[PDB]
Amino acid sequence: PVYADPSYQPEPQIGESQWNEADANAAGGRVLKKTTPMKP
Amino acid sequence: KPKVVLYSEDVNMETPDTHLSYKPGKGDENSKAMLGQQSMPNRPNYIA
């Protein structure tokens, strides 16, 4: 029962390994808080 | 009524100048996962 270490996981450069992936029942990812200026 | 027809056949499958850059798992058994295998060209090698 290991969870993602929030300080660096999930790592933005890691995703699914194949083009034909089955929709995930549960997914994760990082996101920038509203307090960080938006840039392209 | 049939809308699509597929002429299925076996062929002498080869991959003489490429190798897999990604294989779902172990064993070369056909599966849905195998649809995502990735091929990569072999390294050039001039000999003379």
Tab-separated table of N, CA and C in Angstrom:
chain	number	residue	atom	x	y	z
A	1	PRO	N	0.821	-1.217	0.000
A	1	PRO	CA	0.000	0.000	0.000
A	1	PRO	C	0.855	1.267	0.000
A	2	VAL	N	1.482	1.558	-1.137
A	2	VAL	CA	2.333	2.735	-1.257
A	2	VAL	C	1.650	3.837	-2.057
A	3	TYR	N	1.647	5.046	-1.509
A	3	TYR	CA	1.036	6.178	-2.188
A	3	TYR	C	2.113	7.055	-2.799
A	4	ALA	N	1.695	7.990	-3.641
A	4	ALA	CA	2.631	8.892	-4.291
A	4	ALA	C	3.195	9.900	-3.302
A	5	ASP	N	4.516	10.065	-3.316
A	5	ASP	CA	5.175	11.029	-2.444
A	5	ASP	C	4.903	12.386	-3.078
A	6	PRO	N	3.990	13.172	-2.484
A	6	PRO	CA	3.611	14.500	-2.981
A	6	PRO	C	4.712	15.519	-3.268
A	7	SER	N	5.906	15.330	-2.718
A	7	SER	CA	6.969	16.293	-2.975
A	7	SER	C	7.497	16.185	-4.405
A	8	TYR	N	7.357	15.017	-5.026
A	8	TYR	CA	7.825	14.864	-6.400
A	8	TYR	C	6.993	13.903	-7.243
A	9	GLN	N	6.072	13.185	-6.608
A	9	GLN	CA	5.217	12.255	-7.338
A	9	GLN	C	3.765	12.721	-7.270
A	10	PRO	N	3.021	12.589	-8.384
A	10	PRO	CA	3.499	12.034	-9.657
A	10	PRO	C	4.452	12.966	-10.410
A	11	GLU	N	5.367	12.378	-11.173
A	11	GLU	CA	6.335	13.156	-11.945
A	11	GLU	C	5.715	13.475	-13.300
A	12	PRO	N	5.549	14.770	-13.603
A	12	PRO	CA	4.955	15.235	-14.858
A	12	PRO	C	5.441	14.587	-16.151
A	13	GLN	N	6.672	14.083	-16.173
A	13	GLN	CA	7.190	13.478	-17.394
A	13	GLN	C	6.881	11.990	-17.537
A	14	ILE	N	6.090	11.446	-16.618
A	14	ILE	CA	5.730	10.031	-16.669
A	14	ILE	C	4.224	9.835	-16.883
A	15	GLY	N	3.866	9.133	-17.953
A	15	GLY	CA	2.467	8.885	-18.243
A	15	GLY	C	2.238	7.429	-18.602
A	16	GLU	N	1.315	7.173	-19.521
A	16	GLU	CA	1.047	5.804	-19.933
A	16	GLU	C	2.046	5.399	-21.018
A	17	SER	N	2.403	4.119	-21.043
A	17	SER	CA	3.388	3.603	-21.987
A	17	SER	C	2.938	3.200	-23.388
A	18	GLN	N	1.636	3.089	-23.623
A	18	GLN	CA	1.152	2.701	-24.950
A	18	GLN	C	0.116	3.675	-25.464
A	19	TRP	N	-0.087	3.678	-26.779
A	19	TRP	CA	-1.064	4.573	-27.383
A	19	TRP	C	-2.482	4.075	-27.153
A	20	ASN	N	-2.640	2.765	-27.016
A	20	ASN	CA	-3.959	2.182	-26.807
A	20	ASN	C	-4.216	1.826	-25.346
A	21	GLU	N	-4.236	2.832	-24.482
A	21	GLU	CA	-4.470	2.594	-23.066
A	21	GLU	C	-5.947	2.585	-22.723
A	22	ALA	N	-6.292	1.810	-21.703
A	22	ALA	CA	-7.670	1.724	-21.251
A	22	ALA	C	-7.875	2.883	-20.288
A	23	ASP	N	-9.008	3.575	-20.409
A	23	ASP	CA	-9.313	4.704	-19.534
A	23	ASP	C	-9.037	4.299	-18.087
A	24	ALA	N	-8.287	5.129	-17.371
A	24	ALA	CA	-7.934	4.836	-15.989
A	24	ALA	C	-9.083	5.048	-15.017
A	25	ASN	N	-9.261	4.094	-14.112
A	25	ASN	CA	-10.309	4.185	-13.105
A	25	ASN	C	-9.889	5.246	-12.093
A	26	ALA	N	-8.581	5.451	-11.980
A	26	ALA	CA	-8.024	6.428	-11.055
A	26	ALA	C	-6.738	7.008	-11.636
A	27	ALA	N	-6.656	8.332	-11.707
A	27	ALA	CA	-5.475	8.986	-12.254
A	27	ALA	C	-4.947	10.082	-11.342
A	28	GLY	N	-3.719	10.509	-11.608
A	28	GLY	CA	-3.105	11.556	-10.817
A	28	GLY	C	-2.269	12.482	-11.681
A	29	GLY	N	-1.930	13.641	-11.133
A	29	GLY	CA	-1.132	14.601	-11.867
A	29	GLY	C	-0.897	15.842	-11.035
A	30	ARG	N	0.030	16.685	-11.471
A	30	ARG	CA	0.335	17.907	-10.750
A	30	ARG	C	-0.432	19.066	-11.361
A	31	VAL	N	-0.539	20.153	-10.609
A	31	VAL	CA	-1.244	21.337	-11.072
A	31	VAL	C	-0.721	22.547	-10.309
A	32	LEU	N	-0.700	23.695	-10.976
A	32	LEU	CA	-0.214	24.921	-10.368
A	32	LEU	C	-1.332	25.708	-9.673
A	33	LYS	N	-1.105	26.040	-8.401
A	33	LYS	CA	-2.068	26.800	-7.605
A	33	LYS	C	-2.330	28.168	-8.223
A	34	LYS	N	-3.495	28.728	-7.917
A	34	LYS	CA	-3.892	30.032	-8.429
A	34	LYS	C	-2.955	31.155	-7.991
A	35	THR	N	-2.102	30.880	-7.009
A	35	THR	CA	-1.161	31.886	-6.519
A	35	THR	C	0.122	31.968	-7.345
A	36	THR	N	0.247	31.086	-8.328
A	36	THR	CA	1.404	31.080	-9.210
A	36	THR	C	0.967	31.725	-10.519
A	37	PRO	N	1.715	32.735	-10.986
A	37	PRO	CA	1.335	33.390	-12.240
A	37	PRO	C	1.276	32.416	-13.415
A	38	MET	N	0.252	32.569	-14.248
A	38	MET	CA	0.078	31.715	-15.414
A	38	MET	C	1.016	32.130	-16.538
A	39	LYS	N	1.734	31.156	-17.087
A	39	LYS	CA	2.652	31.390	-18.199
A	39	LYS	C	2.499	30.215	-19.153
A	40	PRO	N	2.758	30.434	-20.450
A	40	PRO	CA	2.632	29.336	-21.414
A	40	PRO	C	3.679	28.257	-21.120
B	1	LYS	N	-27.086	-7.969	-42.752
B	1	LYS	CA	-26.298	-7.975	-43.977
B	1	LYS	C	-24.877	-7.490	-43.697
B	2	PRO	N	-23.879	-8.109	-44.347
B	2	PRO	CA	-22.473	-7.738	-44.167
B	2	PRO	C	-22.177	-6.328	-44.675
B	3	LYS	N	-21.407	-5.573	-43.903
B	3	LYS	CA	-21.056	-4.218	-44.293
B	3	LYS	C	-19.556	-4.150	-44.566
B	4	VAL	N	-18.808	-5.057	-43.940
B	4	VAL	CA	-17.353	-5.119	-44.096
B	4	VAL	C	-16.856	-6.548	-44.317
B	5	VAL	N	-15.831	-6.696	-45.153
B	5	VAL	CA	-15.236	-8.005	-45.427
B	5	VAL	C	-13.722	-7.890	-45.304
B	6	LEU	N	-13.108	-8.826	-44.595
B	6	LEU	CA	-11.663	-8.810	-44.431
B	6	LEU	C	-11.063	-10.073	-45.018
B	7	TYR	N	-10.130	-9.915	-45.947
B	7	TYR	CA	-9.467	-11.066	-46.540
B	7	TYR	C	-8.276	-11.381	-45.644
B	8	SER	N	-8.477	-12.288	-44.693
B	8	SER	CA	-7.422	-12.657	-43.756
B	8	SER	C	-6.447	-13.645	-44.370
B	9	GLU	N	-5.188	-13.559	-43.949
B	9	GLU	CA	-4.162	-14.451	-44.468
B	9	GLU	C	-2.959	-14.449	-43.536
B	10	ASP	N	-2.054	-15.398	-43.756
B	10	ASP	CA	-0.814	-15.495	-42.993
B	10	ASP	C	0.259	-15.021	-43.966
B	11	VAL	N	1.309	-14.389	-43.455
B	11	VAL	CA	2.391	-13.923	-44.315
B	11	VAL	C	3.713	-14.227	-43.641
B	12	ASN	N	4.773	-14.311	-44.435
B	12	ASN	CA	6.105	-14.586	-43.915
B	12	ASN	C	6.652	-13.305	-43.281
B	13	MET	N	6.054	-12.919	-42.159
B	13	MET	CA	6.424	-11.709	-41.426
B	13	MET	C	7.898	-11.589	-41.045
B	14	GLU	N	8.487	-10.440	-41.371
B	14	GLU	CA	9.881	-10.150	-41.045
B	14	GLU	C	10.049	-8.695	-40.626
B	15	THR	N	11.161	-8.419	-39.959
B	15	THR	CA	11.529	-7.070	-39.535
B	15	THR	C	13.055	-7.093	-39.586
B	16	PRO	N	13.611	-7.162	-40.803
B	16	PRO	CA	15.049	-7.206	-41.072
B	16	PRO	C	15.922	-6.036	-40.638
B	17	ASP	N	15.394	-4.816	-40.651
B	17	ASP	CA	16.212	-3.671	-40.267
B	17	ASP	C	15.738	-2.871	-39.062
B	18	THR	N	14.844	-3.441	-38.258
B	18	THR	CA	14.348	-2.747	-37.066
B	18	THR	C	14.239	-3.679	-35.867
B	19	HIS	N	14.127	-3.095	-34.679
B	19	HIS	CA	13.956	-3.865	-33.453
B	19	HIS	C	12.941	-3.124	-32.588
B	20	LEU	N	12.379	-3.807	-31.599
B	20	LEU	CA	11.374	-3.200	-30.736
B	20	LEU	C	11.975	-2.233	-29.740
B	21	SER	N	11.363	-1.061	-29.618
B	21	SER	CA	11.824	-0.066	-28.663
B	21	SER	C	10.919	-0.182	-27.444
B	22	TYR	N	9.840	-0.950	-27.590
B	22	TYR	CA	8.880	-1.168	-26.510
B	22	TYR	C	8.023	-2.406	-26.732
B	23	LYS	N	8.025	-3.303	-25.753
B	23	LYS	CA	7.223	-4.519	-25.812
B	23	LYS	C	6.454	-4.603	-24.488
B	24	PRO	N	5.110	-4.632	-24.550
B	24	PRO	CA	4.227	-4.707	-23.381
B	24	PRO	C	4.703	-5.649	-22.277
B	25	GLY	N	5.045	-6.878	-22.642
B	25	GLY	CA	5.503	-7.820	-21.638
B	25	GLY	C	6.406	-8.905	-22.187
B	26	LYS	N	6.499	-10.010	-21.456
B	26	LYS	CA	7.338	-11.128	-21.865
B	26	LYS	C	6.553	-12.097	-22.739
B	27	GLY	N	7.266	-12.837	-23.582
B	27	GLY	CA	6.605	-13.787	-24.458
B	27	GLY	C	5.981	-13.093	-25.650
B	28	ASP	N	6.202	-13.649	-26.836
B	28	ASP	CA	5.670	-13.069	-28.061
B	28	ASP	C	4.330	-13.671	-28.477
B	29	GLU	N	3.345	-13.597	-27.588
B	29	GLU	CA	2.009	-14.115	-27.880
B	29	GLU	C	1.126	-12.937	-28.277
B	30	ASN	N	0.395	-13.087	-29.378
B	30	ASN	CA	-0.485	-12.028	-29.855
B	30	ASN	C	-1.529	-11.662	-28.801
B	31	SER	N	-1.745	-10.366	-28.611
B	31	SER	CA	-2.725	-9.888	-27.641
B	31	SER	C	-3.102	-8.452	-27.964
B	32	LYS	N	-4.064	-7.910	-27.223
B	32	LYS	CA	-4.503	-6.537	-27.438
B	32	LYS	C	-3.377	-5.590	-27.046
B	33	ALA	N	-2.606	-5.981	-26.037
B	33	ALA	CA	-1.499	-5.164	-25.558
B	33	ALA	C	-0.435	-5.018	-26.641
B	34	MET	N	-0.218	-6.095	-27.385
B	34	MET	CA	0.772	-6.106	-28.445
B	34	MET	C	0.473	-5.098	-29.550
B	35	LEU	N	-0.712	-4.502	-29.515
B	35	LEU	CA	-1.065	-3.512	-30.522
B	35	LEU	C	-0.228	-2.256	-30.317
B	36	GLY	N	0.289	-2.087	-29.107
B	36	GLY	CA	1.082	-0.912	-28.805
B	36	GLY	C	2.592	-1.059	-28.887
B	37	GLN	N	3.088	-2.188	-29.393
B	37	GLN	CA	4.534	-2.363	-29.508
B	37	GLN	C	5.078	-1.204	-30.334
B	38	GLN	N	6.299	-0.794	-30.027
B	38	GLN	CA	6.923	0.291	-30.764
B	38	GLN	C	8.185	-0.213	-31.443
B	39	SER	N	8.320	0.127	-32.715
B	39	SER	CA	9.477	-0.294	-33.479
B	39	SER	C	10.485	0.840	-33.598
B	40	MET	N	11.745	0.467	-33.770
B	40	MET	CA	12.823	1.426	-33.884
B	40	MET	C	13.832	0.922	-34.913
B	41	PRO	N	14.351	1.820	-35.764
B	41	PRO	CA	15.323	1.382	-36.772
B	41	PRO	C	16.642	0.928	-36.146
B	42	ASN	N	17.259	-0.103	-36.720
B	42	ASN	CA	18.537	-0.587	-36.203
B	42	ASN	C	19.620	0.440	-36.517
B	43	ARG	N	20.701	0.412	-35.748
B	43	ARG	CA	21.802	1.345	-35.942
B	43	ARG	C	22.532	1.093	-37.253
B	44	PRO	N	22.945	2.165	-37.937
B	44	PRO	CA	23.659	1.952	-39.199
B	44	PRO	C	25.012	1.311	-38.904
B	45	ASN	N	25.520	0.517	-39.837
B	45	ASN	CA	26.818	-0.113	-39.630
B	45	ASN	C	27.488	-0.365	-40.976
B	46	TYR	N	28.333	0.575	-41.385
B	46	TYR	CA	29.047	0.452	-42.646
B	46	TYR	C	30.227	-0.484	-42.445
B	47	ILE	N	30.410	-1.397	-43.392
B	47	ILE	CA	31.505	-2.353	-43.339
B	47	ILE	C	32.190	-2.338	-44.692
B	48	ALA	N	33.511	-2.193	-44.679
B	48	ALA	CA	34.266	-2.130	-45.916
B	48	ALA	C	35.750	-2.345	-45.674
